[PDB]
Design a protein around this nucleic acid. Structure first.
Lengths: 107, 98, 590, 82, 93, 86, 95, 93, 107
DNA sequence: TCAGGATGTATATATCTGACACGTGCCTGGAGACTAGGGAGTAATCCCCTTGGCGGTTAAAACGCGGGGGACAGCGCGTACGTGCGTTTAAGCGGTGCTAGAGCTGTCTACGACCAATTGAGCGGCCTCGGCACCGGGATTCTCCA
DNA sequence: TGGAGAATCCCGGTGCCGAGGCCGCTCAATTGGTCGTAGACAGCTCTAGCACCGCTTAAACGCACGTACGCGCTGTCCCCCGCGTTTTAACCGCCAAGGGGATTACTCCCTAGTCTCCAGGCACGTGTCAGATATATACATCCTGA
C-alpha cells in the first residue's frame, strides 16, 4: 500500500524513523519499543519549538529577521527553566546578558 | 581646561559597550601561539584545525568572563569595588577548583 | 743524635694535602697532538665555562640554590652551544654513524628542559648583574640575607628587569675594560701596544735654549694608541632586546663572551665579593709551603698508591719521632710541669699505641694508617695543623687559590680537568671533593652500589650536579706560546674527551693503551694509529712515571664510573621533583 | 623550533576587556598576572584531554571535535562546533 | 560523503512558529547541537532506568520517566503532555 | 487506616543541632538569623532529592522508597554516596 | 566562667573528632515524610532510606558551612551571617 | 539469591597489604561501592571512545585511554603500568 | 583439562571472568576484546590496594586493628590524587578532617 | 613575666559483649574446545587544508604623567551573641501486634528482532537576490564645571 | 540650577555574500511476513514497615547577665584611571608546497555463540577478643592574680 511516514502518523515534524535508528545504534538497551521513538521525537520537537519561539521574539525586538546566536543566548538566559536546563552550556558567539551591579552605579 | 571624565565613567561606558557586543576580546594570533606552546609538552609536531583553535578561544573567554563575575561578587561582598587576587582565589576555592 | 733526634718533618717534602704545579714543568716541547682519538672534541668555549663554574662554586652564599647544581650540559643547552668547531660553535651536531642532518637540541631532547636551562641562564645573568651593580647599597642592604636574585625576581612583572642594569653597564664598561674579542683590533698594522699612533713629536729639540741642561724628558713623544672597543651598534652590549628577552638575544659566542666579562667585572667591582676575596686570600697567613697561584690535593697530583706509600713511610718515621719526642731529656724535664696539653695526651696515647702497634704485624702496618686516621687527626697539633693527607675542602687559605675540577697532571701532555659542580660550604653531603680516605670509601659504596638513585637524590642529589664532562687542557703548548711570543688570539687549548658513561669507558679503553709502556722500544699500541689515534708513544723512557700517573688516573676514572653513571641514571629516573612514595609503592605492590 | 613566553601575548588591555564584559568596574594591578596563571591552568587541562583523544584516534591533527569532547568531559558543553 | 543533521526539521518548526523569520548558519549549528545534546541526555537516563529495573527494553515509560527527571517543572509537564498526545495519535491510527 | 497530615516539622531541626553542624564545619560564632536560612536551605535540598527518589519509586511500581532510590537520586545530582549499596 | 570563645573551639575540636550524626533522628524522619507527602500520598520508607537521606543532608550542610566560614573571613568577620550563605550558594551555582 | 560483591577480593588484597589488619562490615560495604563506581566510570569512558572512533570493540587500548582520561597524574601512570604488566603476563603465558 | 583461572594467569586477585561478564552484559559495546577484562581488573586491583594501604596506616596510627569508615575517609582526604578522584563522593560515617582556620585561633 | 587552683584531657586497669573470623554443602557460572564470519588491519591514492612567506596598513598596545578616589587603619559605642543554670520535653529504647506489600514463581501471548522488496524523502550541487553591515552627515543625549 | 563639548542615535544610500529555493539521485525508511522470548499477570509467602505504650533521662528551652565583636565615622596616602603620544605587530590578501586524513579493495584472525563439566563462591552454622564502657590517675590548659 501507499506508505505514510511514522512521523506523519503522529503529527510531528521531527523524524520518528531517524530517532528510532539512532536509538538502536546507540547501544542504549538491547531492545527499543515501538512508542519510544515517537514519544522522544515529540519531546524534542516541543523543546525546539520553545527555543525557537523565544529566540524569534528576541530577534524581533532588534528589528532583525535572521536569528543569530546572540538571540539564542538572550532567549535561553532570560527564561528560568531553559536557563536551568542549559546551565552548564556555552553558546558560541553568544555574549552575556547586560547586567551591572547596583553598587557600581553612580550616586 | 582640557575636558576630562571623572574616574569611573569611562569604565561604565566600556562595561555597557562590551556587554552589548559578542566578538572575541583576545587577539587571534597571540592566543594561537599560546595554544601551540602549551601543546608542545604533550606531543611534538601537532597540527591544529582552525576551528579547534576557535573552539578553545570561545571556551576560554567564556570561562574567564564567568570567573570575573564571581570575582566581582566576592569583591562587593567584602565592601569594595576593586577586584583583588584574593577575590579570584576565594571564588575558585568556593567553586571547587582549588 | 741526642735521643735519635726528632726526624724533621720538613715542609718541602712533607707538605699538607695541598701540593702545587709551579706552572713550568713543561719547559720542553710537548706540542705533539698524539693523544688524539675518535672521541676527542675541540671546544673553544670550554675554559670560559670552566671559569664560570669555578666562580659560581667559590661563591655559593651569593647565588640561588638552583644555580649551585648546574652542570656543563646545562650551560651548553641554555646558551645553545655545540662542540667541535675551532672557529666558535659547530652549528648542530651530527647523529649516528652517518647523518645528512644535525641533532639541534630541539630535535633531540624534551623541550621544557631546554626552556628550564635557558631560564637558569637568565637567572644567572641577572644575579651577576645584581651583585655587580646593586652596590650603591654595598653588599649589605634591605635584601641582605639570601641570594640577591631569585626566580620570582626574574619572573617579576617589571618586564624589563635587565634594562636599568644594562644602562648602568654600558656606562661603566667603556672604562672597566673590554675583552680582547671585543677590542677594536687594529686594521692599521702599526699602532701596536709598545709603539704608538701618530708622530706628535714634530722634531727632536736638539737646539736647546739652555746649554747647561742638555738632558730632555721629551725625546720623541707620540699620540697614545690605547685600544678601543667596538662601535656602539656593533657592541653587542648595546642590543636593545636584552631589556625584555634577556641574555638569549646575542650570538651564542657573544653570550659566552658577555658572561665571562661580567664575571671579571663582578670579581673586580662587586665590592662585596671584591673585599671578600682579598680578605680570603691574603689574610694573616702564607701558604704552608709558599705563595703559589694554582694548587691541588696530593692524591690528585701523584695518586692513591704513591701518596699512601710515601705517607706510610712518613707515618712510621713520625711515630718513631713521637717516641723520641717524649723520652727526650729536656722534653722529659719540661713534661713534669705540664708544658702543653697536647705534649701529654699525644705522648701518652702514642705510647699506648706504640705498645698496641708494635704488636701489629708488618701486614697490618699498611692497614693501621687507614684504620687509625680517625684518632690520627688530633695528633697533628705540634706538627702541621693539617695532615699531609687531609681534607683540602676545609681551609680558608686554600680556598681562593684552589682549583677543584682538576683531576691530574701528566708529563708532555697536559692536565685532565673534571668540571663537575659546587663543593664549597653547601652541597658537601655527597661531595666527591673530599679527603682520599672517605673519597675512596664513597666510591667503594658505589661500586657495590649500597646507595642507589632513590637514596642518591634523597641525599641532596638535586643539589648535586646530575651530569658531567671531561676535558684535557694543553698546558705545555699555551705556556710555551706565552713564553715565546704569544701566537694566541683565538687558539684552542681545551679538548673534550667523554660526556657520558659510554664515552667514559671508550676513553678508558683508549687511555689504557697509553698506559701500555713502549715495548715498541724493543720492537721488531695497536694498528691504524698514525691515522686516527697515535697509540704508540715515542719509544723512550720519558713516559714511565707519566704512565704510572696514567695508571692511577685510569683507576680513579674507573672508580668514578660507578658514581657517574649513578647520577646519569638518577637524573633520568627523577629529573622532576615527584612523589616517589608511589614509585616505591610500585615495587612493594609488584 | 621552541616556543616560549607566549602567555605574555595575553595583554593587560585584553584582560581588562574581559573584566569589563564581566561587569567589573575597578581592577587592581596584581590581577593581570594572577589571571594569566588561571588561564594557563585551564588550557592545560583541556588541551591535555584533547590530545589524549587525538593520540587515541592515531591522528596528528587536533580536530574541533576533540576539543568539544574534552570540554564536555570537564562539564563545559560547547554549542556550535559540531 | 553524506552528513546527517537536524537542519530541515528545525527549519520546519521555525516556519510553524515564526512564519517570516530566518536563521543563520551558526545559529542552525547551535540548534543542531542542542537537539543532539538533549537527545543524548534523555536516552542515557532511559538506559539507566531500564538497567535498574532489570529490563532489556526501552519503552514509553522509560522515556516519560527520563523526561520527568531531566526537565524542570513546567517544561516537564508540557513535554509529557505532548509526548502522550503523539503516542496516542500514533496508536489510535 | 491512619493517614495523618503533618505540619511544621521543619522546626524539629532545632537550633542546637544547627550549631553542632556549624561546629563540625569550623564556625566559631553564629548570627541569630542563620537558623531560618539553614532550615530553608535544608528544605530545598531535601525537596530536590526526594522528588527524584519518589520518581524512581513510581517508575518501579513500588510503594516503598528504598535505599537504592535515594542513592540513584543523589548520584543523578552529582552527590555520589558510599555505604548503602549500589 | 570561660571567656566567650573557649568553649567554642573546644566544641569545634569535639565535633570534628567524631563521626556520629548531629541531628535527632525522629524529627528528621518526620521532616522527610512531610516533604514526601506532596509528591505521593501514603508512601512507605525503608529505614535505611531515611538514614541515607540524613547522611547526605548532614554532609551537605557541613560543606556549606565551610564555604560560609570562608566567605565570612573574607569580609573580615568571624560571625557567619545569611549574606555568607547566600554568597556561597550563588557562587556554587545553586542560586 | 546469591547477590554478588567484591568482598572476598578486597579482603585478599588487604591481607596482602597489611597482613594483620581487619576491616569492618560497613567499611567493606564502602569499598565495594568504590570498586563499582570506578568500574562504571572507566567502562563508560571506554564506551564513549569506541563510539567516537566508529568501532564496535572495547580493547585494552580503550581501557588505557579511559584510565589516562579519568585518573589524576601519578595514579594514571601507575595504573597504566600495572595494566600493561598484567596483559603482558596474561598473553605470554 | 585442569582449569586455571584467567585471573591466576595474569597474577591478579580480582576476577577476570566476572569483569568480562559485567562488560559483556553492561551494554558498553557490541564486542569486548580479550585483554580488556585483564587490564580493567589490574587497574581496579591497583586502586583498591592503594586506598587500603593508606587506610591501614591511618587505622594503625589510631591504635586500631580494624578499618572503619573514618579511616577510609582520612586516607582519601589526606591524599591529593585520591581526593581529586573522589572529590564528589560522600563516605558514610566518615566525618571530616580536623582543620580550624588560623584567624579563629586564640592569641 | 610565674604561679596556683579548677577543669578538661591523655593514661592505665577491669569486664563485657557482639561483631568479626573460621568452618560445611551446593549450585551456578567460569573454563575448555570449536567453528564461522565479519570487524579490523594493511596498502595505494588523492586532494585539500594546514603551515610558512611577503608586504602594506593601520589599529591596538605600550609608555608616561597627573590627580582623584578608594583601600585601609584606627577608634568608639551598643547591642547581640555566648555561657550557665534550673525546668520541661520528647527522643530513644524495649516490647507487642498487625497487615501492606516486597519478592519470587509459573503461564503464555503479544511485541520486537530480523529480512527481503520497494520507494520517496532528504542530501549535495548550483544560482540568485535581499537582509544586513558599513559609512557619512545631522540630532539628540549625556556628562561636567558653573 | 544651565550651557559647552563629547558620545551615541538615526536616516538614507550602497554593496555583497550567504540564506533559501530547485533538481537529480541515492539509500534509508517503510511494508509485510515469520519467529522467539520478555514481560504482563495471577497467586502465594512472609518480611518488615507502621502504630502504640511505658519508663529513663539527656537534650532542648527559657531567662539572666556581660563583653566582644560588628559597624559607622574619620583621616591618609597610594595606586589605578583617563588621556596623549609613540611604536609594534596583528591582520589581510595572495601564493605555494606537501603532509595527512579520507576513501577503496583485499585478507585474515578474533570474538561470539554453543555445549559440557566441575569447583569457587555464597549461604548457613559456630567461637572470642577488639573495642566500648567503667573507673581510677597524673598532665596540660585556662583564668585570675602579683
Amino acid at each position: 500500500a501507499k506508505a505514510k511516514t511514522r512521523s506523519s502518523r503522529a503529527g510531528l515534524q521531527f523524524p520518528v524513523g531517524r530517532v528510532h535508528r539512532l536509538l538502536r545504534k546507540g547501544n542504549y538497551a538491547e531492545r527499543v519499543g515501538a512508542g519510544a521513538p515517537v514519544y522522544l521525537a515529540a519531546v524534542l520537537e516541543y523543546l525546539t519549538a520553545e527555543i525557537l519561539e523565544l529566540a524569534g521574539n528576541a530577534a524581533r525586538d532588534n528589528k532583525k529577521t535572521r536569528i543569530i546566536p546572540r538571540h539564542l543566548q538572550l532567549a535561553v538566559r532570560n527564561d528560568e527553566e531553559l536557563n536551568k536546563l542549559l546551565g552548564r552550556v556555552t553558546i558560541a558567539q553568544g555574549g552575556v546578558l547586560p547586567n551591572i551591579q547596583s553598587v557600581l552605579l553612580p550616586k | 581646561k582640557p575636558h576630562r571624565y571623572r574616574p569611573g565613567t569611562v569604565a561604565l561606558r566600556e562595561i555597557r559597550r562590551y556587554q552589548k557586543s559578542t566578538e572575541l576580546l583576545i587577539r587571534k594570533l597571540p592566543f594561537q601561539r599560546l595554544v601551540r606552546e602549551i601543546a608542545q609538552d604533550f606531543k611534538t609536531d601537532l597540527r591544529f584545525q582552525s576551528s579547534a583553535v576557535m573552539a578553545l578561544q570561545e571556551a576560554s573567554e567564556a570561562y574567564l568572563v564567568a570567573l570575573f563575575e564571581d570575582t566581582n561578587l566576592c569583591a562587593i561582598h567584602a565592601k569594595r569595588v576593586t577586584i583583588m587576587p584574593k577575590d579570584i582565589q576565594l571564588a575558585r576555592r568556593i567553586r571547587g577548583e582549588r | 743524635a741526642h735521643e735519635q733526634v726528632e726526624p724533621a718533618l720538613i715542609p718541602s717534602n712533607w707538605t699538607s694535602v695541598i701540593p702545587l704545579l709551579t706552572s713550568d714543568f713543561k719547559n720542553q716541547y710537548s706540542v705533539i697532538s698524539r693523544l688524539k682519538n675518535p672521541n676527542m672534541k675541540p671546544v673553544p668555549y670550554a675554559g670560559d665555562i670552566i671559569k664560570l663554574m669555578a666562580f659560581i662554586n667559590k661563591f655559593s652564599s651569593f647565588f640561588h640554590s638552583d644555580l649551585q647544581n648546574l652542570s656543563f650540559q646545562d650551560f651548553e643547552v641554555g646558551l645553545d652551544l655545540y662542540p667541535g668547531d675551532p672557529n666558535g660553535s659547530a652549528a648542530g651536531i651530527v647523529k649516528g654513524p652517518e647523518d645528512t642532518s644535525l641533532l639541534l637540541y630541539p630535535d633531540f631532547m624534551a623541550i621544557k628542559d631546554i626552556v628550564y636551562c635557558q631560564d637558569k641562564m637568565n637567572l644567572l645573568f641577572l644575579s651577576l648583574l645584581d651583585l655587580t651593580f646593586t652596590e650603591n647599597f654595598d653588599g649589605k642592604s634591605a635584601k641582605k640575607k639570601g641570594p640577591l636574585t631569585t626566580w620570582e625576581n626574574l619572573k617579576s612583572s617589571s618586564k624589563k628587569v635587565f634594562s636599568n642594569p644594562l644602562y648602568r653597564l654600558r656606562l661603566v664598561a667603556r672604562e672597566w675594560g673590554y675583552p680582547r674579542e671585543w677590542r677594536q683590533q687594529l686594521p692599521s698594522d702599526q699602532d701596536i701596544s709598545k709603539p704608538k699612533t701618530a708622530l706628535f713629536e714634530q722634531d727632536e729639540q736638539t737646539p736647546v735654549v739652555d746649554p747647561s741642561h742638555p738632558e730632555i724628558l721629551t725625546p720623541n713623544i707620540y699620540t697614545w694608541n690605547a685600544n678601543e672597543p667596538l662601535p656602539l651598534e656593533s657592541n653587542p652590549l648595546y642590543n636593545r632586546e636584552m631589556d625584555k628577552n634577556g641574555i638569549l638575544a646575542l650570538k651564542p659566542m657573544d653570550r659566552v663572551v658577555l658572561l665571562r666579562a661580567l664575571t671579571d667585572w663582578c670579581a673586580s667591582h662587586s665590592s662585596a665579593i671584591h673585599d671578600e676575596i682579598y680578605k680570603l686570600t691574603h689574610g694573616k697567613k702564607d701558604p704552608v709551603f709558599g705563595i703559589q697561584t694554582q694548587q691541588v690535593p696530593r692524591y690528585t697530583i701523584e695518586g692513591v698508591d704513591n701518596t699512601i706509600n710515601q705517607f706510610k713511610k712518613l707515618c712510621s718515621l713520625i711515630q718513631s719521632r713521637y717516641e723520641i719526642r717524649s723520652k727526650k731529656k729536656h722534653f722529659v724535664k719540661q713534661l713534669k710541669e705540664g708544658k702543653k696539653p697536647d705534649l701529654s695526651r699525644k705522648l701518652e696515647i702514642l705510647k699506648e699505641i706504640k705498645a698496641e702497634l708494635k704488636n701489629a704485624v708488618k701486614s697490618e702496618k699498611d692497614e693501621l694508617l687507614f684504620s687509625l686516621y680517625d684518632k690520627w687527626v688530633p695528633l697533628f697539633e705540634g706538627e702541621l695543623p693539617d695532615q699531609p693527607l687531609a681534607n683540602p675542602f676545609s681551609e680558608r687559605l686554600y680556598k681562593l687559590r684552589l682549583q677543584e675540577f682538576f683531576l691530574g697532571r701528566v708529563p708532555h701532555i697536559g692536565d685532565f680537568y673534571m668540571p663537575r659542580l659546587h663543593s664549597y660550604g653547601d652541597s658537601l653531603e655527597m661531595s666527591t671533593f673530599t679527603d682520599l680516605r672517605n673519597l675512596q670509601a664513597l666510591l667503594s659504596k658505589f661500586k657495590n652500589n649500597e646507595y642507589n638513585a632513590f637514596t642518591l637524590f634523597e641525599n641532596d642529589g638535586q643539589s648535586m650536579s646530575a651530569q658531567f664532562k671531561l676535558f684535557y687542557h694543553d698546558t705545555p703548548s699555551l705556556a710555551h706560546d706565552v713564553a715565546r711570543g704569544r701566537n694566541t688570539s683565538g687558539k684552542v687549548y681545551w679538548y673534550e674527551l667523554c660526556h657520558d658513561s659510554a664515552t667514559l669507558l671508550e676513553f678508558l679503553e683508549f687511555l689504557d693503551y697509553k698506559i701500555v709502556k713502549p715495548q715498541d722500544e724493543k720492537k721488531e699500541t695497536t694498528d691504524n694509529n698514525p691515522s686516527i689515534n697515535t697509540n704508540p708513544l715515542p719509544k723512550d723512557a720519558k713516559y714511565n712515571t707519566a704512565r704510572k700517573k696514567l695508571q692511577i688516573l685510569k683507576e680513579f676514572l674507573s672508580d668514578y664510573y660507578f658514581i657517574l653513571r649513578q647520577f646519569e641514571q638518577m637524573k633520568v629516573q627523577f629529573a622532576d621533583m615527584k612523589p616517589g612514595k608511589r614509585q616505591l609503592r610500585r615495587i612493594q605492590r609488584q | 623550533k621552541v616556543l616560549r613566553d607566549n602567555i605574555q601575548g595575553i595583554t593587560k588591555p585584553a584582560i581588562r576587556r574581559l573584566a569589563r564584559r564581566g561587569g567589573v568596574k575597578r581592577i587592581s594591578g596584581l590581577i593581570y598576572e594572577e589571571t594569566r596563571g588561571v588561564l594557563k591552568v585551564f588550557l592545560e587541562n583541556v588541551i591535555r584531554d584533547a590530545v589524549t583523544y587525538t593520540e587515541h584516534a592515531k591522528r596528528k591533527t587536533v580536530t574541533a571535535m576533540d576539543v568539544v569532547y574534552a570540554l564536555k568531559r570537564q562539564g563545559r558543553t560547547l554549542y556550535g562546533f559540531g | 560523503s553524506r552528513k546527517e543533521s537536524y537542519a530541515i526539521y528545525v527549519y520546519k518548526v521555525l516556519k510553524q512558529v515564526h512564519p517570516d523569520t530566518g536563521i543563520s548558519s551558526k545559529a542552525m549549528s547551535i540548534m543542531n547541537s542542542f537537539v543532539n545534546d538533549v537527545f543524548e541526555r534523555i536516552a542515557g537516563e532511559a538506559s539507566r532506568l531500564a538497567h535498574y529495573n532489570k529490563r532489556s527494553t526501552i519503552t514509553s515509560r522509560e522515556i516519560q520517566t527520563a523526561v520527568r527527571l531531566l526537565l524542570p517543572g513546567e517544561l516537564a509537564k508540557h513535554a509529557v503532555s505532548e509526548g502522550t498526545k503523539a503516542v496516542t495519535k500514533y496508536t489510535s491510527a
